[PDB]
Design a protein around this ligand. Structure first.
Ligand SMILES: [Zn+2]
Ligand SMILES: [Zn+2]
Length: 121
């Protein structure tokens, strides 16, 4: 007989897996930092109705535009500070901070969930 070959490590166990659970080493944590300044409309008249002189002139430095984050919500990727327009796919340029997509990396490039698999692997 020669009936000694069946599927034992593939389609017999076709269960659905997490979208990048084993790619944890390439995964980044998108930390969405909330700004407690401005979420209260009753706080004051923005930066006009109230003389709130702030000593912080640098705030959080962005690694995307190279300046400082003057955006509302700043996001985390890899280890640097970002915001909506800078935290995006280097292939899509789609604002990852405007989506909340758990992007991945490998060679320093920031690629979206799907792009990393298509690009590198
Ligand atoms: Zn930026
Ligand atoms: Zn992409």
């Amino acid at each position: 007989s020669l009936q000694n070959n069946q599927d034992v490590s593939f389609e017999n166990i076709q269960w659905s897996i997490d979208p990048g659970a084993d790619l944890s080493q390439y995964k980044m944590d998108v930390t969405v930092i909330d700004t407690k300044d401005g979420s209260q409309s009753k706080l004051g008249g923005g930066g006009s109705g109230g003389h709130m002189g702030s000593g912080g002139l640098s705030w959080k430095r962005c690694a995307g535009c190279g300046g400082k984050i003057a955006d509302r919500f700043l996001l985390y990727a890899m280890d640097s500070y970002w915001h909506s327009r800078c935290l995006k796919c280097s292939s899509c340029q789609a604002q990852l901070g405007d989506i909340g997509t758990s992007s991945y990396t490998k060679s320093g490039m920031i690629l979206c969930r799907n792009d990393y698999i298509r690009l590198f692997g």
